[PDB]
């Protein structure tokens, strides 16, 4: 069975050899335990009638088998209780971190569920403790009665068939009942998921549901949904329990049926008395690892899903680069016939656009929606390749530049966010990490942030609280302006936060932007009359189709879409 084993040996790392040595040690430990029960056959055969020489012979052979089994089980769990699992999950997390580094950014930027997924791997990678815990229990459950049963096939042959029949009717029949088992768990689960959807709808809009009026209709609807879930759970659980209790008592009914078959073959056939007592011992020995194995049959589902999610995530390939021998001295971003279809939620987010942003001062744009206005800025860092088109920067395609040169060429100024409330020297250092302190003091006063630096305590090495507590919208935006001012990127995308920042800090933010726009291309989307009229080459987009080029004057005197939106 390769499709889980090659994943389990690829998603360990450089500890594959010690994992296979520990798997071999635990397989030999379970087989030698089966041989210890085979040595429990002639010990009972000898002790039925005394026989101190035969009892001493097979008791010292049982001492050898028990000591080899316990020492090999100790060496098998040595894989977990040395540092081999620590270094295994460590190398797996430092492979997944670099996979977070070179994943194309639209795959994690695409969905909130996608970012919550990629958030989860570094913390859900802790199940390898469970995958070394399951190995010993499943190996006991399948190997140990197989060795004892194939030992009975040439010690009296009539207990051998039934004891070889009990456990493949247990665990391979468990993995053949895994269709009906996951049917039971999914008949609970899908009802639990629609109830969880009603619960998260209730939990999000609880304020609107309280202050709206339907806290008698929708609330009692949720409560009747709770009662419906409880009745569905009991109505599934009755047949589930009637089927599942026999699965738990497989070893008990197998023990009593071997009792009856041994008794009828003692009084009808051979002298199988001592071998019957030792087989009665054997099956009650096999009782406990199946009693743990049915307690771990959810953890194997969780581990198989986690290994599928890892080896579905680590198969994500980066963006293709080709023949980087370019130095883009000119910054003339000309999208030509770009038609990028985004997802199943938004369709053709652009449709054959023609964009040119050649100015060393500014070239604004306004668009229709999330498709046509900001997904072109998403395309501008090649987050996704266009399904048809070309992205030039001066004269070179953007799929030719390496992401180091590309991500040092252009820089975005965000909405508000990402300082991590540390020393602000480090944040305007992760502007461009080869910066000295004097470069920070030169490029922080040009963003008009130095007065806020002197206003706060501790000087420049100060923590901003727990999330930027003394920093504000208008002060923490000047950090994101100081980052693009220190980085000195000759192309700046500028998501202007003016709609949130206007009445309190539009003076400081506009002064910082006017310091920023000098001698570099700036692409800005905003709604303020200074930014709507007095920008430069102003673009109008409807679902990713460009109209109303040029400045605001000729588009305004054209009396088209821009005059229509500006007149209100």
């Amino acid at each position: 069975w390769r499709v889980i084993w090659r994943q389990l040996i690829s998603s360990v790392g450089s500890q594959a050899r010690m994992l296979r040595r520990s798997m071999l040690a635990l397989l030999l430990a379970a087989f030698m335990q089966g041989i210890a029960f085979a040595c429990l056959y002639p010990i009972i055969d000898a002790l039925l009638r005394g026989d101190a020489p035969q009892l001493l012979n097979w008791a010292m052979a049982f001492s050898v088998a028990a000591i080899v089994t316990l020492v090999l089980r100790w060496y098998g769990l040595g894989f977990e209780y040395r540092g081999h699992l620590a270094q295994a999950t460590h190398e797996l997390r430092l492979r997944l971190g670099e996979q977070l580094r070179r994943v194309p950014l639209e795959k994690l930027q695409r969905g909130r569920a996608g970012e919550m997924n990629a958030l989860l791997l570094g913390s859900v990678d802790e199940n390898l403790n469970y995958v070394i815990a399951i190995a010993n229990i499943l190996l006991l459950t399948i190997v140990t009665p197989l060795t004892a049963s194939l030992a009975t096939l040439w010690i009296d042959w009539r207990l051998g068939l039934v004891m070889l029949l009990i456990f493949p009717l247990l665990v391979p029949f468990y993995y053949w009942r895994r269709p009906a088992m996951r049917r039971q768990m999914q008949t609970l689960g899908e009802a639990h998921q629609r109830l969880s959807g009603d619960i998260v709808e209730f939990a999000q809009g609880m304020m609107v549901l309280r202050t709206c009026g339907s806290d008698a209709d929708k609330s009692r609807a949720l409560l009747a949904h709770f009662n419906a879930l409880e009745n569905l759970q009991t109505r599934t659980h009755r047949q589930g329990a009637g089927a599942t209790m026999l699965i738990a008592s497989v070893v008990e009914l197998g023990l009593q049926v071997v009792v009856l078959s041994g008794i009828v073959w003692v009084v009808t056939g051979t002298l199988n008395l001592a071998f019957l007592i030792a087989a009665v011992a054997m099956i009650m020995r096999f009782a406990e690892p199946m009693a743990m194995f049915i307690s771990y049959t959810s953890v194997v589902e969780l581990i198989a899903s986690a290994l599928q999610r890892i080896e579905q995530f680590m198969a994500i390939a980066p963006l293709p680069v080709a023949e980087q021998s370019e130095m883009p001295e000119r910054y003339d971003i000309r999208f030509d016939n770009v038609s990028y279809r985004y997802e199943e939620g938004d369709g053709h987010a652009l449709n054959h656009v023609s964009l040119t942003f050649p100015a060393a001062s500014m070239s604004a744009l306004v668009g229709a929606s999330g498709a046509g206005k900001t997904t072109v800025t998403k395309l501008l860092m090649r987050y996704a390749d266009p399904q048809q088109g070309q992205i030039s920067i001066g004269g070179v395609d953007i799929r030719r530049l390496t992401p180091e040169q590309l991500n040092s060429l252009i820089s975005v100024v965000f909405q508000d966010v990402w300082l991590f409330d540390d020393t602000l020297l480090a944040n305007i250092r992760i502007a461009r990490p080869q910066a000295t302190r004097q470069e920070v003091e030169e490029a922080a006063r040009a963003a008009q942030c130095l007065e806020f630096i002197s206003r706060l305590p501790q000087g420049w090495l100060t923590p901003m609280g727990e999330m930027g507590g003394q920093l504000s919208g208008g002060e923490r935006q000047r950090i994101s302006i100081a980052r693009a001012l220190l980085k000195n990127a000759p192309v700046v995308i500028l998501d202007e936060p003016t709609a949130a920042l206007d009445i309190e800090s539009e003076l400081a933010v506009q002064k910082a932007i006017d310091n920023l726009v000098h001698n570099r291309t700036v692409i800005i989307i905003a709604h303020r009359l200074s930014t709507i009229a007095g920008a430069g080459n102003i673009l109008v987009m409807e679902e990713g189709q460009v109209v109303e080029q040029g400045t605001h004057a000729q588009l305004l005197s054209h009396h088209g879409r821009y005059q229509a939106l500006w007149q209100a």
Binding site: L85, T211, G345, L507
Partner: protein
């Protein structure tokens, strides 16, 4: 012990599984009795003891099945009672302690804690009965069966626990330190995976990845030394719960008793079964202790959730009341963030029928008035006489009736026609519903959506929601009458169509209402009756827009700031 839960059904299930374990011991003892009857005389098949064996097996299975059914019914009923009590507590929860504090925590608790309680009860009551009744009855039966070899099987069980407890002389000292290193790496992976979509627009990601790597390589040196502390103890406990040490003690006491006085053989095999049962009964004790610890954790979480809010002081008694909106001496702080005073003695009358657009500092002393109007919280010093009597006698249905909030985000459900229906009147007056969407000028984009007016928008329908959620909820506010309209922030959606269509929709919304348009721009401030200035919780000026402009105070300064951009 615990009395207030469903104790009758779960104590019945616990005692029933305990009697099932006792009759399984009865089945094993009748098996040894039957083999005594067949070894002392090899004869025909023994009727009474083998009938007792098969009867005790089928009684043990039937009893354990009924214990399973009754324990799972107890778990289902306790899960239902807990979800009902959490829903009825969260329905009556003070909303400022709800959306600002634990927006996603309530669904997290109302899924995870109740699933933990179901799983704990249904999977932990037969474990309780087995691990406290099987190894305390096997000791009685073994002491009855043989005076020696119960001391020997207790010796091979207790040698492991003696060496295990004596191994704590080389002490651990690593619960709190390991737990804080675990919390530290689970913070510094979350910080990384949040910093990864952002820092890639900078340099390629090197400093955040180096911080994440050097926060991994400290937690590895905590985890590895924790393993090299717990290694001998856990490997020795996993080697002592193997049946082979118990088998070794039984066999080499079977040879050690052939010399110095032989115990009989069938008493030896009756020791051989029950001693291995008593030896295996240590592991489910550890499993139920593992479940009891984390269940006590989750029950402490459910009790802090159940004890944190108390009903927001509700009274539905007084009246609906006219002369709609005033304040009276309210100076309320913002809870759980600032221990100061987010208002300072705000006192104003408003005659019903006029528009009071108020402006202040960045929503820090401005939007908290709109939070305090809905009774999201109550003032530490003050009374809010909405009409005659204040919100201590609020008549909590009329707060749903009289006040029509419209906020800056306005979360929607997945039934878009009922997203404008299910605010104030759940029914189907669909001609009036499309008329209210017609006069609010949101009928066009909902007419253009694929699944009619009843479009399943969900959470993935970004095109179906769009930037017109304000137009949907304002049309919903035009559906019902609801005299007080409340705008927390309009025109924060800066789209050009939302620049155009929101103004006519609001002009269709301020008809016959005493609104409070808390707007961030000074757009509709010019067309409003009273313009309040705020500055760090203190109200500064009262009066109209042109009166505040003519007096030339700090409103002149703010309007001159706004005339720049």
């Amino acid at each position: 012990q615990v009395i207030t839960p469903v104790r009758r059904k779960v104590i019945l299930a616990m005692a029933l599984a305990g009697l099932a374990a006792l009759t399984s011991l009865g089945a094993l003892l009748f098996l040894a009795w039957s083999l005594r009857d067949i070894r002392a005389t090899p004869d025909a098949i023994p009727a009474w003891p083998l009938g007792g064996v098969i009867g005790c097996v089928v009684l043990t299975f039937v009893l354990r099945l009924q214990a399973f059914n009754t324990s799972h019914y107890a778990a289902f009923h306790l899960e239902n009672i807990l979800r009902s009590r959490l829903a009825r507590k969260a329905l009556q929860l003070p909303p400022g302690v709800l959306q600002q504090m634990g927006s996603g925590s309530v669904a997290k608790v109302m899924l995870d804690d109740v699933k933990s309680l179901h799983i704990f009860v249904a999977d932990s009551t037969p474990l309780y009965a087995r691990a406290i009744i099987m190894p305390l009855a096997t000791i009685v039966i073994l002491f009855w069966l043989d005076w020696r070899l119960a001391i020997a099987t207790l010796g091979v069980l207790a040698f492991g626990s003696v060496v295990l407890v004596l191994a704590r002389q080389r002490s651990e000292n690593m619960a709190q330190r390991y737990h804080k290193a675990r919390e530290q790496v689970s913070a510094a992976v979350i910080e990384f995976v949040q910093a990864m979509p952002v820092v890639r627009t900078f340099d390629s990601g090197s400093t955040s990845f180096l911080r994440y790597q050097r926060a991994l390589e400290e937690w590895v040196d905590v985890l590895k030394t924790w393993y090299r502390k717990a290694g001998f103890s856990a490997r020795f406990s996993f080697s002592i719960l193997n049946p082979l040490p118990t088998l070794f003690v039984l066999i080499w006491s079977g040879y050690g008793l052939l010399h110095y006085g032989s115990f009989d053989f069938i008493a030896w095999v009756a020791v051989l079964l029950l001693g291995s049962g008593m030896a295996e009964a240590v592991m489910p004790m550890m499993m139920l202790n593992n479940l009891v610890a984390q269940t006590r954790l989750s029950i402490q979480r459910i009790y802090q959730v159940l004890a944190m809010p108390e009903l927001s002081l509700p009274q539905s008694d007084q009246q609906p009341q006219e002369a709609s909106i005033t304040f009276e001496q309210v100076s309320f702080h913002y809870p759980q963030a600032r221990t100061g005073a987010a208002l300072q003695e705000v006192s104003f009358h408003v005659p019903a029928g006029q528009i009071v657009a108020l402006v202040g500092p960045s929503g820090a002393g401005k939007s908290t008035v709109a939070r305090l109007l809905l009774r999201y919280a109550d003032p530490d010093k003050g009374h809010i006489r909405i009409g005659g009597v204040d919100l201590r006698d609020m008549q909590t249905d009329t707060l749903m009736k009289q006040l029509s909030f419209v906020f800056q985000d306005n979360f929607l459900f997945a039934d878009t026609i009922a997203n404008n229906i299910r605010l104030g009147a759940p029914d189907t007056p669909l001609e009036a519903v499309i008329a209210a969407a017609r006069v609010a000028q949101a009928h066009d984009f909902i007419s253009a959506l694929p699944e009619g007016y009843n479009t399943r928008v969900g959470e993935r329908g970004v095109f179906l929601s769009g930037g017109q959620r304000q137009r949907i909820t304002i049309a919903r506010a035009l559906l019902q009458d609801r005299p007080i309209l409340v705008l927390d922030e309009a025109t924060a959606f800066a789209d050009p169509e939302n620049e155009a269509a929101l103004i006519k929709a609001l002009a269709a919304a301020m008809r016959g209402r005493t609104v409070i348009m808390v707007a961030h721009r000074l757009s509709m401030v010019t067309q409003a009756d009273v313009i309040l200035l705020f500055s760090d919780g203190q109200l500064r000026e009262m009066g109209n827009h042109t009166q505040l402009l003519a007096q030339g105070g700090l409103y002149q300064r703010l309007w001159q700031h706004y005339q720049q951009a």
